Design a protein around this ligand. Structure first.
Ligand SMILES: NCCC[C@H](N)C(=O)O
Ligand SMILES: NCCC[C@H](N)C(=O)O
Ligand SMILES: NCCC[C@H](N)C(=O)O
Ligand SMILES: NCCC[C@H](N)C(=O)O
Ligand code: NA
Ligand code: NA
Ligand code: NA
Ligand code: NA
Lengths: 304, 304, 304
């Protein structure tokens, strides 16, 4: 496959190989050495439909550390969908660059970019999913717990793009994934069903977070109103009463539970300060691993 | 000459030399060579007053492939001529960088930048002209037709910055150039006269596109309302009825006619989808050639 | 010390050593050497709260020339203190990059960034101070006058961030510094006192520019502020009558006096055209030296 649009576009063995390579190249960089430059003479255009810190800095810095040059095309720079159609952007950038990263709104825009591009496309977040984040999260789990297989991962909050990529991972690695969400804020039904069809993981959707978290290896949260839906924050506050991850919830989860959050976090909304800053919080190692997982994904896509 | 502001600031032999060099360096990059780095240790500031995908990505990527670093200064980053006088911008950037690219509104802003800069300045599009686009277009014609000399190029649409640079090329290479435009939307009379003064090319301005295109080697179009004039889009849509490039017009043009468009294109306005996507449309090879022509221009200006 | 937040966080010997290195590396780059690349494999995130030409281009170009990659994170890219707390930004970017440069409003935001970052932080301008600008200005003085020690520097204008960093330098190098400001627009009392405490320099605050400038080595001007309340703007205009640096004021200053201005300049407001363009004006060499002083600063912070 040419592109990295969803984790479960790939098989188990391939995903595990990418995660192994992620550890290997991370260790090389951590050693302080800077003479492994496989991307020398290669370029990446990064299309962003909305501003970013983690995705932007991790991709641009990682690509540089492996020898290439990433271009930042911000929202107003190329105005994809206003000034110019996706299919034309894809066909132009494919003639200049070796790979394209895109963070878009409608998922169909990333499918269109992939379909019309002759070079690989990497998904940097859409309204539907966030595969590179979950790949990083899998690496983080491997480093802290030992493995993803057989763990219990409990997401608390909105059934959103992050939950969809957790469901992708649950389609290629066998674990127990729970989404504790308010009624009416479930993840997409087809995405849940596709994970169940894979037959690897125990998948549960529940409205009771206090029961869901018990025995977790990971309690995961995210904002209740995502980029592109910030005008909905107030009604969601009401619907999401009881879904804040606070110290009491982490105590219910138990002593082996780590806290994870893709970031940015809104303290006092989906999570408390005390949770973010607790010893069991691994949000900053988690953020770092965006660069290491993505480096391995790009290596894979470019034939290394 | 220090700068690349207009094609016919240079003589015929120099323009032909730059186009040759464009082919040579293109072949080297297409071969996979990444060890020709003449711009090692050099920097370029790119000043953009306007949106850009082709100009931005072609300049930044090409400069990187030849070993240098291009800085992207977008519309709100330095605000040349508004936050700070152009003469001051020129004199500061000339002390940091080795070359400056600028995309501006008033042509006088680019003249000011060139006049006060000790380093070469490259025009990346003004309200007046767009010489690097037409240099790429000439390379594209050489590759598809064999040569520019003795061809018939028919531009259909607004008498604009693209037409001005076509007229620049017609001042240094002998061919037949027709601009078919609605009454009131003619190119600048002084620019037409300067092309005619050179005595190389047959130059016609007409309001009848259906006659104009007959026997064309190239039918060229562009948006009817350029950047900076988008408040006129509805008025222009009405004034330009009869100037859309559709499949019927390309049939009138004949069997040897290629379709070219600088891009971005607005299907259903100046051109149909069927024309943009036809076998005779070479818009994507055309766009690629921005990088190859500009690479040669920059090499020439920097003494290579 | 990990960070470069204010010049007099460092001792005299260290500041002099940095300025000596600034000359040495400048001379190496001026020779045409591009083989000294101490920042190979290193990255820098640059956080900007507002537009910038000098700080932006000098940091990005300089870091490139010494072998690293600087990322530009503009006002709408991360929103430090607004979309995401400074402590979170610090802890994320510290895991991707080797050094962070920040231009912020509240000084407390730069302190917070330094406190939470495991990597060095460089202050690129706050509401409080601008230490990299004054380090550049010291280098410029050394080159033109021969030394900072024993000179007379007269700043004419608002008691602002630039005055604060002048007072920082006067706390580590013995000279005579005068701030000639409208009554009511004095620099912060504590910053003046801290400079006096160091016991090196003669420090004067006055409201009489025509007397202040007599015998100056440097007459210094700066951006003048625009006002949010329209009667407050008119009152400020009235207060600053007599504080324009014109040819008459430079004549009163005398034959030894150079004119300096951190830029951008607004001719007809703080300074006249005739002064900016005069033979005694060194504003363009001054601007260049932002790159050379900052290169030495970054070298020092990174252990070179
Ligand atoms: N086994 C690879 C060692 C690291 C090497 N010195 C580097 O430059 O990455
Ligand atoms: N930075 C993580 C982004 C994920 C979030 N659900 C969003 O779509 O905003
Ligand atoms: N990308 C090409 C731009 C040319 C057009 N006439 C404009 O000025 O908008
Ligand atoms: N580019 C000048 C920076 C210093 C100025 N006093 C300001 O605060 O804007
Ligand atoms: Na993200
Ligand atoms: Na263009
Ligand atoms: Na109109
Ligand atoms: Na500045």
């Amino acid at each position: 496959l040419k592109d990295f649009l969803a984790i479960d576009d790939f098989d188990t063995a391939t995903i595990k190989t990418i995660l192994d390579k992620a550890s290997e190249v991370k260790a090389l960089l951590k050693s302080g050495e800077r003479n492994y430059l496989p991307f020398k003479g290669k370029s990446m255009s990064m299309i962003f439909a909305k501003p970013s810190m983690r995705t932007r800095v991790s991709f641009e810095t990682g690509f540089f550390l492996l020898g290439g040059h990433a271009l930042y095309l911000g929202p107003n720079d190329i105005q994809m969908g206003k000034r110019e159609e996706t299919r034309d952007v894809a066909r132009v950038l494919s003639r200049y660059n070796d790979i394209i990263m895109a963070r878009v709104f409608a998922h169909q825009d990333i499918l269109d970019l992939a379909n019309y591009s002759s070079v690989p496309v990497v998904n940097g977040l859409t309204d539907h999913n966030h595969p590179c984040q979950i790949m990083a999260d899998a690496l983080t789990m491997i480093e802290h717990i030992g493995q993803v297989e057989g763990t219990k991962v409990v997401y608390v909050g909105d059934g959103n793009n992050m939950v969809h990529s957790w469901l992708e991972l649950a389609s290629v690695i066998p674990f127990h994934f729970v989404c504790a969400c308010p009624k009416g804020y479930e993840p997409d039904k087809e995405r849940v069903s596709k994970a169940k069809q894979a037959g690897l993981s125990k998948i549960e959707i529940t409205n009771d977070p206090k029961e869901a978290v018990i025995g977790a290896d990971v309690v995961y949260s995210d904002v209740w109103a995502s980029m592109g839906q910030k005008d909905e924050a107030e009604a969601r506050r009401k619907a999401f009463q009881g879904f804040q991850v606070d110290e009491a919830l982490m105590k219910l989860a138990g002593q082996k539970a780590y806290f994870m959050h893709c970031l940015p976090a809104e303290r006092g909304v989906e999570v408390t300060n005390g949770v973010v800053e607790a010893p069991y919080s691994i949000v900053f190692p988690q953020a770092e691993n965006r660069m290491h997982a993505q480096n391995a994904i790009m290596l894979h896509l470019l034939g290394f």
